[PDB]
Structure formats: structure tokens, C-alpha cells
Design an enzyme around this catalytic site. Sequence first.
Site, PDB file in Angstrom:
ATOM      1  N   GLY A   5       0.860  -1.202   0.000  1.00  0.00           N
ATOM      2  CA  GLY A   5       0.000   0.000   0.000  1.00  0.00           C
ATOM      3  C   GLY A   5       0.891   1.245   0.000  1.00  0.00           C
ATOM      4  O   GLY A   5       0.428   2.338  -0.302  1.00  0.00           O
ATOM      5  N   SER A  10       3.828   1.266  -1.758  1.00  0.00           N
ATOM      6  CA  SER A  10       4.519   1.249  -3.072  1.00  0.00           C
ATOM      7  C   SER A  10       4.265   2.522  -3.877  1.00  0.00           C
ATOM      8  O   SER A  10       3.154   3.017  -3.838  1.00  0.00           O
ATOM      9  CB  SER A  10       4.054   0.075  -3.948  1.00  0.00           C
ATOM     10  OG  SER A  10       4.558  -1.141  -3.372  1.00  0.00           O
ATOM     11  N   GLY A  11       5.284   2.999  -4.551  1.00  0.00           N
ATOM     12  CA  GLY A  11       5.211   4.227  -5.394  1.00  0.00           C
ATOM     13  C   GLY A  11       5.431   5.509  -4.608  1.00  0.00           C
ATOM     14  O   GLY A  11       5.680   6.546  -5.203  1.00  0.00           O
TER      15      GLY A  11
HETATM   16  N1  LIG Z   1       8.416  -4.488   2.756  1.00  0.00           N
HETATM   17  C1  LIG Z   1       8.392  -3.448   1.975  1.00  0.00           C
HETATM   18  N2  LIG Z   1       9.305  -2.526   2.183  1.00  0.00           N
HETATM   19  C2  LIG Z   1       7.392  -3.306   0.999  1.00  0.00           C
HETATM   20  C3  LIG Z   1       7.213  -2.045   0.367  1.00  0.00           C
HETATM   21  C4  LIG Z   1       6.230  -1.869  -0.613  1.00  0.00           C
HETATM   22  C5  LIG Z   1       5.435  -2.944  -0.952  1.00  0.00           C
HETATM   23  N3  LIG Z   1       4.487  -3.054  -1.831  1.00  0.00           N
HETATM   24  C6  LIG Z   1       4.100  -4.300  -1.794  1.00  0.00           C
HETATM   25  C7  LIG Z   1       3.073  -4.791  -2.598  1.00  0.00           C
HETATM   26  C8  LIG Z   1       2.503  -6.048  -2.377  1.00  0.00           C
HETATM   27  C9  LIG Z   1       1.493  -6.507  -3.216  1.00  0.00           C
HETATM   28  F1  LIG Z   1       0.913  -7.746  -3.034  1.00  0.00           F
HETATM   29  C10 LIG Z   1       1.066  -5.727  -4.275  1.00  0.00           C
HETATM   30  C11 LIG Z   1       1.652  -4.483  -4.521  1.00  0.00           C
HETATM   31  C12 LIG Z   1       2.638  -4.020  -3.680  1.00  0.00           C
HETATM   32  O1  LIG Z   1       3.206  -2.792  -3.923  1.00  0.00           O
HETATM   33  N4  LIG Z   1       4.758  -5.042  -0.908  1.00  0.00           N
HETATM   34  C13 LIG Z   1       5.633  -4.173  -0.434  1.00  0.00           C
HETATM   35  C14 LIG Z   1       6.607  -4.389   0.564  1.00  0.00           C
END
Ligand SMILES: NC(=[NH2+])c1ccc2[nH]c(-c3cc(F)ccc3[O-])nc2c1
Length: 223
Positions: A175, A177-178
Site C-alpha cells: 500500500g 509502493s510508489g
Molecule cells: N516491505 C516493503 N518494504 C514493501 C514495500 C512496498 C510494498 N508493496 C508491496 C506490494 C505487495 C502486493 F501484493 C502488491 C503491490 C505491492 O506494492 N509489498 C511491499 C513491501
Amino acid sequence: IVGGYTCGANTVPYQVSLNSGYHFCGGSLINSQWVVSAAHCYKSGIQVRLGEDNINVVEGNEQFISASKSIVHPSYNSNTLNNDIMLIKLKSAASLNSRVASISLPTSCASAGTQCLISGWGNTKSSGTSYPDVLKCLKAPILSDSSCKSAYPGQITSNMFCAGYLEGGKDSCQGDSGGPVVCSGKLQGIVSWGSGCAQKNKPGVYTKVCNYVSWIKQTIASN
Ligand SMILES: NC(=[NH2+])c1ccc2[nH]c(-c3cc(F)ccc3[O-])nc2c1
Ligand SMILES: [Ca+2]
């Protein structure tokens, strides 16, 4: 954001929420008509929401603008997430003020140990999902390239960097991401991926924006 704190309404004026009937990714406003996000957040039907704090309540300061086009980096690899960056052009320019403002692109890359601010409306639990209504913040340092490659052997390219805590407990998560990784007032990273969220020795991985400044400038100039 896991282990972070409530930012405070409009204290991160360049943070945007990408919406398709629900919040699915974050992004950063770099000028009144363009937003930078992650290529893996690409989908059609994107409405960019600026000036938000509670994404479920219209509290004032929000500006909802449709995306006119999204430009995923031509060399984006969805299997390795190498070149995970996308530019979004807004249908109309946003009104900038103290609550909605753009963030500067960097002129040089940041060094290990630099302290940065990561923000977003992603999951706040590492084991389970709790999504917040308001924006969460996390201060995290950029880690050395050796600790990052030691944590993810063979998966880190020169367009990525790790930031976070090896002890676990504080990290960006699904959530987020981006969204933005700002260090000393400059946009140095885009939230890209990680192994679970806030797990020990598995820091978050971010797109290294300093490697894309000429690409962003040339693409914006021609569109
Ligand atoms: N541990 C992190 N630093 C992280 C950061 C952004 C993420 N975004 C996602 C993500 C997971 C999904 F199943 C779908 C889109 C996502 O951006 N996992 C993520 C994990
Ligand atoms: Ca709102």
C-alpha cells in the site's frame, strides 16, 4: 508503514494517493502537472488525490485530478522490478500552496547513513493487514550497498538501494509502493519491494531516483 507515526495533516505536501475506487499506491508530486510513482503501480483508471490526510474523509485541501497518461519506464522488468519507476501526467495542473507542494529531484545520489522520511497509507502490521485512514511516517537510514546485497543476494541492481532497520519492526509495506523516500529535501527513492514487512534482516528496497533524473527531465520535456 509498520512502526511509524502519524505524520500530522498536510505535513508531507508532495505525497499523493493513486486511487481507482480505493487507495492502491502512493506517489510524489514533482511539479504542478507530474507525479512520479512505481511502474508496478500501473493500471488504467487512475485518479491522483492530492492534499490528503484521511483518505476516507473529505476534510478540505483535497484536489482529485485524473491522470491524462502514465509512462512506465521502457526497461521496467516486472520479474526483477529493475527500473520500477513511472511518471503520471495530470489532466489539469494542481493548485500548489503550503498544503499541496512539489518535492525536488536530486542532483547527486545520497550516501549510506543518510536519514530519510518515508510515508504512505500502506499496511501498519507485519503479520496481518491493518490499513490506516491517515498518513503514516517513518524516518529510516539508507543502508550500505554491502548490507543490502548481503540481505538480498543476486536481487539488487544498481538502480536500487535498501533503507530501514535490520533488527525488524519498522518498514514500508503493501500500500506504500510508489511513494516517497525524501532525504535532505530531495526525492531519493520510490517505495518498491521487500520480503514481507519489517522482518529482521529483510530491509525495504527502493528505486534509486538519482539514476533517473535525465530520463525524467527528457520525458517530461517531450510530453
Ligand atoms: N516491505 C516493503 N518494504 C514493501 C514495500 C512496498 C510494498 N508493496 C508491496 C506490494 C505487495 C502486493 F501484493 C502488491 C503491490 C505491492 O506494492 N509489498 C511491499 C513491501
Ligand atoms: Ca480526505
